[PDB]
Design a protein around this nucleic acid. Structure first.
Ligand code: ATP
Lengths: 835, 58
RNA sequence: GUCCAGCGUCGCUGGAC
């Protein structure tokens, strides 16, 4: 039972007996000094930086104050004057209590005899300080050394300050009436010259049986200090000559041999005490730890209300960083415990103190402000942003990219997992996880924007990592930031426009228009097209779906203007419309904010009706979509792991399509009856389906509102050539939410809003891209009928199926021109294999 | 509401008179100092935007 | 038993009747 108060100043001086956290280890030492002298006798407490050494020493000394040993006031070697010897200080401290007990005597006879006897010793020692502080010998004091004395008849001739001080302690014990006197030194953890004088004095002077010394510090400083002093003994001239590898390693071992012998001789092994960190005190949740600590989060809070430190940090990590109650949030609290105890409260105390006055909520910014100050020195080592008034959304995107570059890992870096071997990178990893969760705070589709720039900007660079030698690393990593413009940007689709050139700089080995989430639609009329394929003409696109088609265009000036159909432009655009809703004026701007004006140049690293109201029919639907967007998206709590995980599914999914539809481009596919036939309107259908697929699995797994997942207990796969993988996940989700009487809008909010997106409706069912698939027609009918419940509109009218499922008609929410479009490099030698 | 005048009778440069807008922040700092007395006691004021910030101490 | 689907450099795996 060790209760702690987070409202007290938590200073070492104010630490009482109730709030002390090292009751067990102190007792092991209090009852260990007494047993020593009763039958070099120097002890050594040990602990890391910020482990509470000073507040622990004062507990031992205070306990011993209340067979009999007296304790001097503790000495801090750092605060002492730079040139004052240690022996001078100890004598003054001893003289204070010796010259205070004499005034306590009641017998006049037993006052002057001892006082004069004691007074003689001080004058005897005062004449011996010549040897301690001097630079050269002087013959004038030779005669003083050769002197006979009637005091104890010193066996050893000369001065020999060791024996002069030895009898002084014996006299002090008689006056103080105690068996032995303890000298306690404090840590040198801020200096490397206070330690050397402390170490030397213990070796030479404090050797008698009437003294017990209790040092304090950590061996790493002491070990580093001694080894530096041993090299000084080697003659300087010897160290320039004889520098051979065999010679250098010869003395390298010998110095380290003298390092360990001297250190072991001074502090015996059977007396060192290691101070337990926060982990061993508490232990694991399932394991057993031999203590129990509870904290306070309220003034005058009842001790019954106090809760374990694991819940005091788990709740902060879970709520502050917005992670699920699981192993992922268990790694953060476990790592956070393995920190100096000084830093632990300053993170913990600051976060809770602000929370109390916050109510008088944006919990992540409370932790963001609190943790930034604590882990501020580790930030500078990785070169992150330091301005506080510029904690902008785009500022974070630069930070993640430069962090993963330093972490030397692109496959896991965007997960923000504190698995980095360096301790500095571990500290900043949790801070970045706090920044990501703070900026979202139920952001109005900024999560969609932050998903692309935050993580896509990282893994796209893996393309250059694959084929790429030290000077070039900073050569590309710098200007690629400049060209792609991360940290400075105006819109999500603006980034996606520059991505097309990045994708198209090096194509697939078969020189085909399919890429990673990219489809090329030819604009130059190729000659003698076999079959019904025609050149992609911009005009034939139907109304109310041209706007969706308009966003999917991205022209790249790379010696020939070629338009690229991209899911990135599609998803990049959704950030633009859902940015802010005040009027229905800029809603149509983003549909053409990237057309006929946005030109993209070759990357430097190449090295080689009236029709004025047809849009307004869809605008009211997009306007109503923002009404649901601006009602539920405020209530979501996006996380720092979804963005690292949604992309990972998406990146692998697209890479499967890229190498699966290369050799399968051939005629008799203008209508897309069956599988194994690759048309342009189906290849793009997969990429938009892949985006809708990765979001579903990740939201169900990791979120905040979804306390417990809603998905089947089976294999998790990605639709690459079919649609059955997507629909079955919908089916198992369906009854499970209805069984618990939980709606989709609350349990799965992130998927719900984006499903009912008017932009993506006319690309989920291309008219000629949908497989006829008399066997698998059951899938698509069941695939679509399920969507009729997730979106209550059911705008299909049941007639648009007939034209696209029987192999003129009027279409509004379906594109009827991509099927006949062609793709560069699409040789048409072979045809459908027999089935 | 923080009422701010522009055409001051003396018309000082920039119309900076006292506790311009930092009044809410100053009261937060002052109250903490008063509560502190009722043992490190050092506070800190970080350098913002490179501002001279000497006028804050005064 | 045959089919659909999925992963690997054909091999391996998943689902249904
Ligand atoms: N038993 C304890 N209860 C509460 N807080 C503690 C305790 N021990 C240490 N601390 C925390 O550690 C901080 C520093 O304590 P202390 O000075 O003893 O540690 P140290 O930094 O290892 O020592 P030193 O000052 O010798 O370098 C305190 O301000 C307090 O926040």
């Amino acid at each position: 039972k060790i209760i702690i108060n987070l409202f007290a100043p938590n200073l070492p001086g104010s630490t009482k007996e109730d709030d002390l956290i090292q009751k067990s280890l102190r007792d092991q030492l209090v009852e260990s000094i007494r047993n020593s002298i009763a039958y070099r006798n120097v002890f050594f407490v040990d602990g890391t930086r910020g482990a509470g050494k000073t507040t622990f020493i004062n507990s031992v000394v205070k306990s011993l104050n209340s067979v009999n040993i007296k304790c001097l006031p503790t000495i801090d070697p750092t605060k002492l004057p730079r040139h004052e010897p240690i022996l001078v200080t100890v004598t003054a401290r001893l003289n204070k209590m010796v010259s205070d007990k004499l005034k306590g005597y009641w017998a006049s006879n037993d006052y002057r005899k001892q006082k004069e006897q004691w007074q003689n010793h001080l004058a005897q020692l005062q004449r011996g300080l010549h040897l301690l502080t001097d630079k050269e010998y002087k013959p004038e004091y030779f005669s003083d050394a050769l002197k006979l004395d009637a005091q104890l008849d010193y066996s050893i001739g000369g001065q020999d300050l060791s024996e002069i001080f030895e009898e002084l302690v014996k006299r002090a014990c008689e006056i103080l009436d105690c068996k032995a006197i303890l000298i306690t030194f404090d840590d040198i953890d801020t200096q490397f010259d206070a330690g050397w004088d402390v170490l030397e004095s213990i070796r030479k002077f404090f050797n008698s049986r009437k003294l017990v010394v209790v040092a304090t510090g950590d061996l790493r400083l002491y070990s580093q200090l001694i080894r530096g002093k041993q090299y000084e003994n080697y003659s300087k001239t010897l160290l320039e000559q004889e520098k051979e590898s065999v010679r250098l390693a010869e003395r390298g071992y010998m110095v380290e041999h003298l390092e360990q012998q001297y250190l072991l001789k001074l502090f015996p092994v059977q007396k060192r005490i290691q101070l337990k960190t926060m982990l061993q005190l508490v232990g694991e949740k399932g394991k057993a730890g031999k203590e129990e600590i509870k904290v306070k989060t309220e003034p005058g809070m009842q001790d019954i209300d106090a809760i374990d430190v694991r819940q005091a940090i788990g709740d902060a990590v879970r709520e502050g960083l917005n992670l699920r109650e699981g192993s992922d949030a268990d790694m953060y609290v476990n790592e956070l415990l393995k920190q100096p105890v000084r830093l632990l409260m300053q993170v913990l105390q600051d976060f809770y103190t602000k929370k109390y006055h916050a109510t008088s909520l944006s919990v992540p910014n409370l932790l963001r402000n609190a943790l930034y100050g604590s882990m501020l020195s580790s930030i500078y080592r990785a070169g992150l942003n330091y301005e506080q008034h510029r904690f902008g959304m785009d500022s974070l995107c630069k930070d993640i990219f430069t962090y993963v570059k330093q972490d030397r890992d692109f496959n896991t870096g965007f997960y923000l997992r504190p698995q980095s071997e360096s301790e500095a990178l571990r500290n900043c990893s949790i801070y970045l996880a706090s920044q990501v969760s703070e900026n979202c705070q139920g952001s109005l589709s900024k999560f969609l924007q932050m998903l692309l720039v935050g993580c896509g900007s990282v893994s796209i660079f893996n393309q250059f990592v694959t084929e790429l030698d030290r000077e070039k690393f900073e050569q590309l990593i710098s200007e690629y930031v400049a060209y792609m413009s991360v940290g400075r940007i105006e819109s999500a689709s603006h980034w996606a426009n520059r991505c097309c050139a990045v994708v198209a700089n090096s194509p697939n080995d078969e020189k085909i228009g399919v890429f990673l989430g990219m489809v090329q639609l030819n604009r130059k009329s190729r000659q003698h097209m076999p079959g019904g394929y025609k050149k992609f003409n911009i005009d034939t696109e139907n109304g109310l779906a041209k706007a969706a088609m308009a966003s999917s265009l991205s022209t790249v000036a790379s010696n020939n203007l070629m338009d690229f159909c991209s899911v990135f432009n599609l998803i990049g655009a959704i950030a633009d419309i859902s940015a802010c809703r005040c009027e229905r004026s800029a809603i149509t701007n983003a549909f053409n904010k990237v057309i006929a004006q946005t030109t993209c140049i070759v990357p430097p690293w190449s090295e080689a009706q009236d029709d004025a109201t047809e849009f307004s029919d869809a605008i009211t639907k997009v306007e109503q979509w923002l009404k649901n967007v601006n009602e539920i998206e405020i209530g979501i709590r996006p996380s720092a792991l979804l963005i690292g995980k949604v992309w990972s599914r998406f990146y692998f999914n697209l890479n499967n399509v890229a190498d699966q539809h290369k050799t399968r481009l051939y005629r008799n596919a203008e209508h897309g009856r069956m599988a194994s036939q690759s048309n342009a309107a189906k290849i793009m259908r997969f990429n938009v389906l892949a985006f809708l697929h990765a979001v579903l699995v990740e939201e169900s797994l990791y979120h905040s509102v979804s306390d417990r997942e809603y998905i089947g207990e089976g294999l998790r796969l990605n639709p690459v050539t079919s649609v059955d993988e997507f629909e079955k996940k919908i089916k198992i989700i369906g009854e499970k939410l209805k069984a618990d009487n939980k709606t989709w809008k609350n349990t799965h909010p992130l998927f719900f809003l984006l499903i009912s997106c008017p932009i993506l409706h006319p690309f989920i069912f291309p008219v000629g891209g949908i497989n006829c698939s008399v066997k698998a027609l059951n899938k698509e009918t069941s695939f679509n009928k399920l969507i009729d419940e997730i979106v209550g509109d059911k705008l299909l009218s049941d007639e648009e199926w007939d034209y696209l499922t029987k192999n003129q008609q009027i279409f509004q929410n379906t594109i009827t021109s991509l099927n006949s479009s062609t793709i560069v490099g699409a040789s048409y030698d072979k045809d459908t294999p027999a089935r | 509401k923080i009422i701010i005048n522009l055409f001051a009778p003396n018309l000082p440069g920039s119309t900076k008179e006292d506790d311009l807008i930092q009044k809410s922040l100053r009261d937060q700092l002052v109250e903490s100092i008063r509560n502190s007395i009722a043992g490190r006691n050092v506070f800190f004021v970080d350098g913002t935007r490179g501002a001279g910030k000497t006028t804050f101490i005064n």
